[PDB]
From a paper:
We recently found that the ClC-3, ClC-4 and ClC-5 clade of endosomal CLC transporters requires the accessory β-subunit TMEM9, which we refer to as T9A or its closely related homolog TMEM9B (T9B) for proper activity in cells and animals. To resolve the mechanism by which T9A and T9B regulate the activity of ClC-3, ClC-4 and ClC-5, we determined structures of ClC-3 alone and in complex with T9A, finding that T9A occludes the Cl− ion pathway and that inhibition requires the endolysosomal signaling lipid phosphatidylinositol 3,5-bisphosphate (PtdIns(3,5)P2). Each ClC-3 protomer comprises a cytosolic N-terminal domain (NTD), a transmembrane domain (TMD) and a cytosolic domain (CD).
Analysis of cryo-EM images of ClC-3 in complex with T9A revealed four classes that can be distinguished by the densities corresponding to T9A. Despite being coexpressed with T9A, we did not observe any densities corresponding to the T9A protomers in the fourth class, possibly because of T9A dissociation during purification. To distinguish this fourth class from the structure of ClC-3 determined in the absence of T9A, we call this class ClC-3/noT9A. A weaker density is also resolved in the same position in ClC-3/noT9A, suggesting that PtdIns(3,5)P2 may bind with lower occupancy when T9A is not stably bound.
Residue numbers in the entry:
A (entry chain A), B (entry chain B): 78 to 174, 187 to 479, 495 to 737, 745 to 810
Write the structure that this text describes.
Amino acid sequence: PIPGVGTYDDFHTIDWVREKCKDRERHRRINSKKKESAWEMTKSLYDAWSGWLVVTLTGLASGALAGLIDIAADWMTDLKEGICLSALWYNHEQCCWCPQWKTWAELIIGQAEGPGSYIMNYIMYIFWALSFAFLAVSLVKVFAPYACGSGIPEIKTILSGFIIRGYLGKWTLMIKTITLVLAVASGLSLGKEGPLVHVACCCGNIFSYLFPKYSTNEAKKREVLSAASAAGVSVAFGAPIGGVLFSLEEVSYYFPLKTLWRSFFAALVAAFVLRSINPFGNSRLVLFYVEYHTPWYLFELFPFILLGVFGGLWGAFFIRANIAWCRRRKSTKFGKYPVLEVIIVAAITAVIAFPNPYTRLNTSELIKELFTDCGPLESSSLCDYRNDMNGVYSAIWQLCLALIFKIIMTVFTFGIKVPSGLFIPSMAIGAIAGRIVGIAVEQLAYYHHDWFIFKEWCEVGADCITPGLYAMVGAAACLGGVTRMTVSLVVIVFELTGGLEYIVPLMAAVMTSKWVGDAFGREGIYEAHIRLNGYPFLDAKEEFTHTTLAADVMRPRRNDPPLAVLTQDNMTVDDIENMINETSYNGFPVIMSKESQRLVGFALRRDLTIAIESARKKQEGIVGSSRVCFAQHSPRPLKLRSILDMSPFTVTDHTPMEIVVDIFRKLGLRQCLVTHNGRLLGIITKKDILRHMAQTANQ
Amino acid sequence: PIPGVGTYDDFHTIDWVREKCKDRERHRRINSKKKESAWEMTKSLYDAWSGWLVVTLTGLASGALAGLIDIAADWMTDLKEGICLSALWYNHEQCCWCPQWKTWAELIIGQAEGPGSYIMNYIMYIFWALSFAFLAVSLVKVFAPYACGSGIPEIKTILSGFIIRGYLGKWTLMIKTITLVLAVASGLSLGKEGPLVHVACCCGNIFSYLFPKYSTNEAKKREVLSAASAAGVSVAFGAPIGGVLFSLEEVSYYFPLKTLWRSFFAALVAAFVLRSINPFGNSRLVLFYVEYHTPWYLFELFPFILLGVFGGLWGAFFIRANIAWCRRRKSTKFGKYPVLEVIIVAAITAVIAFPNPYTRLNTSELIKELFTDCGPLESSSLCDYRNDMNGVYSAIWQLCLALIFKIIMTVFTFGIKVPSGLFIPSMAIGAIAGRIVGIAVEQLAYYHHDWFIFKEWCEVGADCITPGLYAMVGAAACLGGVTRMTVSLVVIVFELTGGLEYIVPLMAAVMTSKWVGDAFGREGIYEAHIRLNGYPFLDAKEEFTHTTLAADVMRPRRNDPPLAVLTQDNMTVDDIENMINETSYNGFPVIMSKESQRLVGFALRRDLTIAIESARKKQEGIVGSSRVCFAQHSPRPLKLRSILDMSPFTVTDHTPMEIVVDIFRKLGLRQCLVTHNGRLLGIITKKDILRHMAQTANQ
Ligand SMILES: CC(C)CCC[C@@H](C)[C@H]1CC[C@H]2[C@@H]3CC=C4C[C@@H](O)CC[C@]4(C)[C@H]3CC[C@]12C
Ligand SMILES: CC(C)CCC[C@@H](C)[C@H]1CC[C@H]2[C@@H]3CC=C4C[C@@H](O)CC[C@]4(C)[C@H]3CC[C@]12C
Ligand SMILES: CC(C)CCC[C@@H](C)[C@H]1CC[C@H]2[C@@H]3CC=C4C[C@@H](O)CC[C@]4(C)[C@H]3CC[C@]12C
Ligand SMILES: CC(C)CCC[C@@H](C)[C@H]1CC[C@H]2[C@@H]3CC=C4C[C@@H](O)CC[C@]4(C)[C@H]3CC[C@]12C
Ligand SMILES: [Cl-]
Ligand SMILES: [Cl-]
Ligand SMILES: [Cl-]
Ligand SMILES: [Cl-]
């Protein structure tokens, strides 16, 4: 057809059936081309390998970017505490891997220990946090506004067919890559693991621009984006299987069979890239590499389930809190000052985090410490009480304070105009809760070994209880409660920790949290953010009442004027242009005759206008007076049959709306023409269905 | 409607849309019921938990049955070599865990070592193999003919909507459980891992009857069956994640999001049940628990890729060979003697297996030995050469003979009328090939360490090459080549071996095999067997030519007589009964009037006859003369509007058949009514689509 036909405007959903049709047509054209010449055969071979090439490129880019982001974030976070003068590039761990590393008090005051030294370290920590937060927020605001947030909700919307031009562009990729490091260094209650999914998706789109097959077709690009998201999760947690599971379960609306293996290969490639730079570019959580000698016991499930509950409860709170706060940001005036809000939040976070050791420590390092088990070699404060008796109260008090601080700050941190992730904060909260619960259980076992359960399961005076396992279970429970992921979450946690023996516990806790979350609402944080942003997302959970019928959702209805229709013949180009300008319809039905109202096809408004303009430019005399004939082949009438869709999806008025919604979800229909007695009556658009579902939810 | 309405006959596909509609109606009824009484609330709570209960029951039963089958198979297989008189229940390993265990030569001849002892052991081995094979085949033939084969192809067909009454019944479960042990003990080239999926599916189907929700609805039962298949794979390989991946990728036509977590929970429950009885009921492959000290090196990929190629090639051969042989069994007279064929095949297998040590050893134990690495503690013959220099030729010769014997015997073993699995033979062939390749690579490294690759990657005089990893890679490659599974296979292998370091190699090899297999055909062994059996399976790969249109596939066509249709009114019950008897159509369209040909609905033949008979019994005077009115409410006309489907799926004649196939696959439509100019013209049934695809394939 005319060039530009089939293209989609910004902020508009795609029609998956049409995309598959163009993909099939292009495949047929290439199949016929091969026989023509050997160069055509080579081009077809390249096209067949285009999927492998694009997924490999996306995985390589995701791994490299994840490594660079990890290294830069670690160095910048260590920069707050001090500086390694001997090796400026080296961070605190590398500097001491110490006299070379000097705290800011040593740099300025000259005294490593003292009230003035502590005060100066406090001010410098706050100043560095503020500087990093301000730089991040300014960079997002100036260059790439889309770089803010995790991006998982927008990726979910896009993979459902939605289009957000510039979200996965080069500008967003670069700005998000820099701002993730800046925000993580700032000490805000956020993580970079989730946003790596968006980073990988941006890389995948950029590489898809290279291959004509994926660039031309939106559905193919969305499969590439699903593979990219799998690779992003893999690099985030070193969980390629977990990444594939997340892609299938969370972000991929449609997950064909081949896309599974493509995503797995991309994730493995990205993980291998990270491993090649190991351990420089691998987060210490990704390199947890720790095991618990004592196998988990059946009675320990009861605490784990409890943790599960807590997780769910916390999620039920967080989804209710953050959303509300976010809604206020969208409704109140404080959302008009993103830079000021970010700076203030960073200031409060640093101010309350510096006094407490756990909060001051970087969140990923705190999660690592909590997951690590206690032992004679370990000198962590958490184990001090175990060394003292076998102060527990002081450690528990500090851990509870850190838990409360993290819980309160994550609500006000998620949603701000900087790249923020919820995975790391949720894992930290759950890990602190699990560490507290495990410490309590160990103390109960040691003090009350006379109990038959403790005596039978654990030998008298034996450290059967491992706080690290409890912390891992709590982190998984909190993540399940907030995100509502069930299997992908468990596999990701297992791959991050490497402990298969603890698969059964984790799952259990996760499920409990999920169920508890479902008690207060079946919508996850990502889904809630999708709804808050107003994106056109249709989900399987959403459903219509049985009484609802297609006639109810028909666009023309009663109050609205008669729906715009196009006669096949006897219509001028000026008439089509006037109809295009008058109405904002995604497309117009085309009928045999005005009186007959017999559906002939459905011509997209964009395609109609593009074809009319291209014909005007190509052929002289088309001043709008010439007629347009949608039928198959002086006036020189314009032919618009090519743009016309000859087999639009048709449903009856008496059809239940549940079947219509199922058709829309399975086939990804942009619109469906409701016809009565063989004649056109109305159109039900995905926008209309989404509007009706939103109205039902608001009720 | 009338009782029995909506039920499906045997060997008939189900309509997923209708199943979902009845599920929604039942859910609405229960939702309204809860408010009526507290007992209704408790019933609704039970119904909501019915999925968890059914999946838990399926997992428990699958784990218990897998453990029992493993124990019985191990004991029976050891029975062939000899007997433990001191403890008859104990097998060879348990007896020596030796003087207590006595070979049949000791029992009869009285001499443990001697030419007569070897001869007698040979005869007793053959006799036990024949006895077990005869008992297995007779048990399948007499009680449960469906117990034969792996059952994965039939489960694939069933999960696509097909109905095979009795396949998942109690008789099949019991007979298959006994016959799997009998066949595995017989020494035939088959495994019990794959068939365990069918066992789990039978357990799930049996348990579904307890819960009304799953028993009443076929689609719900099929989700339970998907969870059951995941649990079966989990027990087979101790790979719950691999089990879920297999369920999603191989057997589940539709995999809703909730079914993912349900399958994961069922698999974990079954694996935990196996672990509780550990190590008695766990196959030694499931308890491989072995690691390779030397990490895999990049150059070792080149052998692995080579192994991949071999795998694919072997698969391409096997699918072409076995199918052909299987086809001969269906076409020739030797398929009329299943007992004789089974006995003869067992005789040849035992005769050629006894002389060679690897073949005589049980296939699972041979796979374990091949996967295990060589070391000073190990006394295996495979490592003898390594001890001698560091006879290799003798070990390689024996391994090659075992490879050829297994490859030839698996072709004639798969498809016989006994429970047989392809997973274990495929892994055995691949493991033997990988062990040979790894031995060759190690010998090259030791002899030619001067090579820059070997010297750089491996220190001079260092055993960097690990034959166990090569054997694992070869097993994965062969399994990928024959089954064509990509991600589930890799995850299953990883969980079976427990080595996450070797995910990248495995995948690589698997990929190569798949690609190589795709060079000789894109249909796997299960798909090829589905096609051979003639089951009505529609796959995404199958597609129609662009020129094909709905009118081409319309049932009435030209030569065929006018399609049967039912007038809404003015028709007698005798007329409907006569139409039912005359035609074998799944259902009849109902129209406003004969002349108008305006589609009103679609009434299933089964529903029509059931409603007519039930009305005749319920109401007197219905002797066939009374008229039937399909319209909404002395003659006392019968009302058949309830059975009538008021919103049948309708498509246009000029529609491309590719869109029709996509609609059928996504929505699982039993039939689609092709209407032209608002009037009914024909029907395209899933049977018609499958027939057209089969015709295209035959060409
Ligand atoms: C267009 C995009 C996909 C290209 C991205 C290429 C990236 C992944 C490349 C560029 C430079 C590469 C690195 C260059 C050097 C080394 C040192 C070597 O001992 C291990 C691999 C390692 C660490 C490479 C890893 C992969 C790497 C980071
Ligand atoms: C926002 C981020 C990217 C900016 C990072 C810049 C950092 C590394 C810069 C900014 C200010 C710098 C310090 C400024 C002054 C001095 C005193 C000198 O005698 C030693 C180096 C030292 C202590 C510098 C170390 C590096 C430093 C901390
Ligand atoms: C209706 C179906 C699902 C019920 C199946 C129940 C099965 C799974 C039950 C019945 C008997 C049970 C066993 C009974 C005793 C023991 C010993 C204990 O130290 C470990 C668990 C173990 C080994 C149990 C495992 C589970 C088991 C095998
Ligand atoms: C098909 C399968 C299930 C049948 C299993 C039955 C097996 C275990 C039976 C059949 C024949 C039996 C043997 C027959 C005779 C004797 C001699 C006696 O002095 C010791 C026991 C011994 C050696 C028996 C051991 C058990 C035995 C091997
Ligand atoms: Cl994160
Ligand atoms: Cl996130
Ligand atoms: Cl098997
Ligand atoms: Cl099998």
